[PDB]
Ligand SMILES: Cc1[nH]c(-c2ccccc2C(F)(F)F)c2c1C(=O)CCCC2
């Protein structure tokens with residue numbers, strides 16, 4: 001059914017991000033002390049990781065396909081906010097962001113976004 005179909009696609013997309021070269025740095029929430037960034041949660045007020053999104057998909061927390069996108073994009077927005085442009089981490093976030101936006105097209109996920117935006121308008 002409709003929601004089952006884009007839940008399955010979102011699970012496939014998120015797993016492809018996890019397996020992207022360097023994607024492991026977004027898999028879990030940043031450990032401020034262990035990663036030597038003690039000010040991280042002073043800057044990032046809405047943290048997000050791939051495993052957070054996977055948990056929301058597993059538990060059924062998303063009601064609209066755009067909610068999945070907003071969370072994944074939040075990962076990359078947090079990355080660009082905290083990390084200086086050109087740094088290793090910022091470069092990796094820009095790369096996976098571009099990969100994610102292309103996957104939303106080639107999988108057809110954006111088609112579910114368009115349908116759902118019309119249903120709930
Ligand atoms: C998105 C993000 N991920 C990681 C991370 C996590 C676990 C292992 C390794 C890393 C790292 F290599 F990227 F640093 C960090 C991070 C930041 O925003 C802060 C800068 C460095 C820490």
Ligand SMILES: [Cl-]
Nearest residue numbers: 022024025088
């Ligand atoms: Cl690493």
